Write a protein that binds this ligand. Structure first.
Ligand SMILES: CC(C)(Oc1ccc(Cl)c(Cl)c1)C(=O)Nc1cccc(-c2csc(C(=N)N)c2)c1
Ligand SMILES: CC(C)(Oc1ccc(Cl)c(Cl)c1)C(=O)Nc1cccc(-c2csc(C(=N)N)c2)c1
Lengths: 5, 236, 236, 5
């Protein structure tokens, strides 16, 4: 998965 | 509210203790109780709220993906029927996830967003609103899927518009909003080109503003800038 | 029981799904429901039950230790009073831990142990009974602390007596029982010499029986034998 | 902590 914050 | 009898300051103290103990469900319950006292949240308190629910819903999302993967294989041509149990249990986890999302969205709507006037608070809460509609979108399949997606988009867009007017391009809230809206474009809205454009433009405009920052602000901004680069590398 | 309407086989299937999803609270609830159907448990089912509750109580124990450490520092000469909150929240986690232990002990008493006649099942359940009294002992401080310790000791001892008569010295249940009873001696009963003697004798008697085993049984036994060695290294 | 299973 891609990075989220 | 089962937290109605506890002091606001005690709820915040116990949220911090729950974090240290990796008890994120407790953390979220304490911070929901603090929000329901009706006062605005400080910067630290907003981040305690976001950390708590991000960890709770993150675990639910991970579990949902495991179960959805098992369910999809169970429905591949050739697989041995095993009954309704995989679907039932995926649905159970999904309903609990939707409940947590609805709780967070309810706190934002009653009444965190309407009382948030400073850019740092208002952008933060609208980013959360986009995030939790995005998590609802990840599991949505019904008559309302497009409306859920558009609710996420609308919240992210209002946050973006404020952040571009009121914050510098290195502000970590602005950067994290752009990071997540870019992922929304890629994973939810089937708009990979928009995702890539947004991540690249955000990274480049931040780069050009780093010279204005202290060492500590530089560290904060470059951390999120690296996540933007990580996603661009994943996508190109 | 909220699981009373679900098929036994469906509860077992969903316990396995919950394990894959790392949803151990769900796993434990499913396996409690399966136990409450009233039938004996197979070997696989006993291990699903133990895995579920070990993970649940393990998280509670970790949290309790974090909070107890913070509480002890808060009560050191020189520290800033911060009110009742640390104690209150440690107590909250402690009460939830005691509840889980009481639930497991209740399942063993109603009626898993009394129906367990084969050594592999009876030793397994009596080991669990010792383990969950041991976890109660870790947090006990009142009039009943010595009785809780002696309940753990008594269960472990009955398990030991059966295992020595009915199982070979490499049986992994026998080895894991000895491992944990040795830790009981060291950490709970203030008997480090007994802990070391038991671990060493168990290791040596197992070593001498490895020649009788298949490759797969050898792997199972030597895994637990390495844990015995690890503890001996820690203690000597 | 010591090892248990
Ligand atoms: C590194 C990370 C993940 O960066 C971002 C960036 C953008 C956004 Cl929008 C967000 Cl949400 C996070 C982060 O957490 N920064 C951060 C910023 C300000 C305060 C806090 C914080 C005060 S208390 C606390 C706690 N955990 N006890 C955490 C933390
Ligand atoms: C490696 C470990 C930890 O060794 C011991 C040794 C002694 C004792 Cl007493 C215990 Cl409890 C465990 C272990 O788990 N062995 C084991 C043995 C037999 C069956 C299973 C099992 C069937 S299904 C399942 C699951 N998780 N879906 C796990 C597992």
């Amino acid at each position: 998965f891609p990075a989220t914050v | 509210g089962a937290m109605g009898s506890m002091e606001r300051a005690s709820l915040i103290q116990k949220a911090k203790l729950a974090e240290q103990a990796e008890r994120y469900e407790d953390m979220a319950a304490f911070m929901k109780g603090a929000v329901e006292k009706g006062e605005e949240l400080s910067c630290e308190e907003r981040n305690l709220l976001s950390v708590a629910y991000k960890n709770v819903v993150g675990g639910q999302r991970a579990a949902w993906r495991v179960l959805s993967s098992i369910e999809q294989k169970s429905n591949e041509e050739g697989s041995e029927e095993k009954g309704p149990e995989v679907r039932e249990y995926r649905e159970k986890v999904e309903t609990e996830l939707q409940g947590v999302c609805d709780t967070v969205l309810g706190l934002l709507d009653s009444h965190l967003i309407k009382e948030a006037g400073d850019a740092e608070s208002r952008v933060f809460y609208l980013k959360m609103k986009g995030d939790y509609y995005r998590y609802l979108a990840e599991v949505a399949t019904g008559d309302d899927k497009k409306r859920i997606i558009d609710s996420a988009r609308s919240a992210y867009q209002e946050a973006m518009d404020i952040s571009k007017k009121e914050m510098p391009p290195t502000n970590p809230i602005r950067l994290g909003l752009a990071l997540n809206f870019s992922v929304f474009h890629y994973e939810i809205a089937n708009s990979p080109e928009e995702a890539i454009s947004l991540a690249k433009t955000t990274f480049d405009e931040a780069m050009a503003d780093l010279h204005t920052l202290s060492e500590d602000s530089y560290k904060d901004s470059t951390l999120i800038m690296q996540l933007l680069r990580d996603n661009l590398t994943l996508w190109t």
